[PDB]
Design a protein around this nucleic acid. Structure first.
Ligand SMILES: [Mn+2]
Ligand SMILES: [Mn+2]
Ligand SMILES: [Mn+2]
Ligand SMILES: [Mn+2]
Ligand SMILES: [Mn+2]
Ligand SMILES: [Mn+2]
Ligand SMILES: [Mn+2]
Ligand SMILES: [Mn+2]
Ligand SMILES: [Mn+2]
Ligand SMILES: [Mn+2]
Ligand SMILES: [Mn+2]
Lengths: 252, 254
DNA sequence: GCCGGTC
DNA sequence: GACCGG
DNA sequence: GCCGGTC
DNA sequence: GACCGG
């Protein structure tokens, strides 16, 4: 991680920050995400990007090459391409006068890049005024496809996927940050990631709870996740028949 | 529907109206047009318009002597409506006039219109027409399935309706404007053609604009035909999952 | 031209 | 994106 | 603690 | 809640 070396500093600047309640179901804690960026672009300016900002810069410094095929080559990693790139029509039609903008389903919120090593940073906000279920972290299926691509291309040293939880509570008319938490996906026991199939097949956890004691290599992390994923997939197929078919057959 | 009679009036008040922007998560973007629909309904169909939580508060305030969740749950007089409109055990019990219900992200309906013992569950979906996107989440197919089971079990086939209003908008300068609307009734559609997106929160998905309204059978028939479709698709999904999330990765396992 | 995954 | 439990 | 539907 | 297509 590139953030980790300064986590304490950004934990300091955030705790207490205030944002105004939205238009008196989704975001609303979003202003914090922007606050993180700003307070990351200041300390690690040359490393910090919005996912879309990175693609723009990358295509921008390659005026010679055009066409989607050539532009995808620019990624130099089947995995990163999968994880970070935009569609066929979007890459083809990119131009300095038609840049990529925020897309709702982008893998990362912040991209920190340094010497070909990418840290995919995802920001999560939490209303701590209440005990809620863990939020969507990332699609279990997307991870499955990443690991497989990592195994196929032996790309075990190209990127990390880290999270930052920012907790806030309502105090008056503003929302105020009261705590933060950092964690790395590839530091946890892949066998213990909870996959909520109904919830868009998302791995679900509270960042403060994600265990950080996995001791094997990156290749072992991916292999063990793929086992865990296939196994949970089979269980879910068994359970759906029990929760969605069995109790309703009497009506057919 | 209690709203179809005045659809033209709602439509004429939304089309063209600008609203100053807040990014625009899309969700945070349409919200204001929803405020407009509610407000409009509140001043024209005032005695029958309510936000789900608002109805619940009104419901309980009217029966102050009724304390404890069971007693308060009895106040619905309908298993189906209870299932679709109720707020959990702990919350129902902890409700007081000093601790009223607020909006819950989970609420089945955005707006609830009711008259003469009949309920209209109204959901208003917003759409950024500046793009062509996948059909949005309409309602959980699982919840619908349970709703049909309860209807059949209790013979409640003429108690409520589930309607959708689509608000189309776009970005024009420094503000959002509304460009068109659409209305449709869930129970007037062909249940067997409802598309269930299992990964997308097991939600029924369709664009309100569109969505057939030809079903000519009864509600009881609508319920059963849906249940058959739900069950069939779930088996189809159990199979797809092996074919898509297991079989293709089996080769990385040990 | 049909289908469905992701934040 | 992030929500508690009839 | 654990599990998992919905907007 | 509502998002397009490497
Ligand atoms: Mn909302
Ligand atoms: Mn090509
Ligand atoms: Mn966003
Ligand atoms: Mn979003
Ligand atoms: Mn994100
Ligand atoms: Mn985020
Ligand atoms: Mn009880
Ligand atoms: Mn709603
Ligand atoms: Mn609402
Ligand atoms: Mn709505
Ligand atoms: Mn607990």
């Amino acid at each position: 991680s590139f953030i980790k070396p300064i986590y304490q500093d950004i934990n300091s600047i955030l705790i207490g920050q205030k944002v105004k309640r939205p238009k008196s179901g989704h975001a609303a804690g979003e202003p914090f995400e922007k606050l993180v960026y700003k307070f990351l672009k200041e300390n690690l300016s040359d490393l910090t990007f919005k996912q879309y900002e990175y693609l723009n810069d990358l295509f921008m410094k390659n005026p010679a090459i055009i066409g989607h095929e050539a532009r995808y080559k620019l990624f130099n990693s089947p995995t990163l391409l999968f994880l970070l790139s935009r569609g066929k029509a979007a890459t083809e039609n990119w131009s300095i006068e038609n840049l990529f903008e925020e897309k709702q389903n982008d893998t990362a919120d912040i991209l920190l890049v340094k010497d070909q090593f990418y840290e995919l940073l995802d920001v999560k906000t939490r209303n701590i005024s209440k005990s809620a279920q863990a939020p969507n972290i990332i699609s279990a299926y997307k991870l499955a496809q990443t690991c497989a691509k990592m195994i196929d291309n032996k790309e075990f040293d190209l990127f990390d996927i880290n999270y930052l939880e920012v907790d806030w509570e309502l105090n008056g008319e503003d929302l105020v940050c009261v705590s933060t938490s950092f964690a790395e996906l590839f530091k946890s026991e892949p066998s213990e990631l909870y996959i909520n199939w109904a919830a868009a097949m998302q791995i679900q956890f509270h960042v403060r709870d994600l265990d950080q004691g996995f001791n094997g290599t990156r290749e072992e992390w991916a292999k063990s996740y793929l086992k865990h994923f296939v196994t949970q997939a089979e269980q879910r197929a068994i359970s759906m028949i029990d929760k969605f078919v069995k109790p309703f057959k009497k009506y057919i």
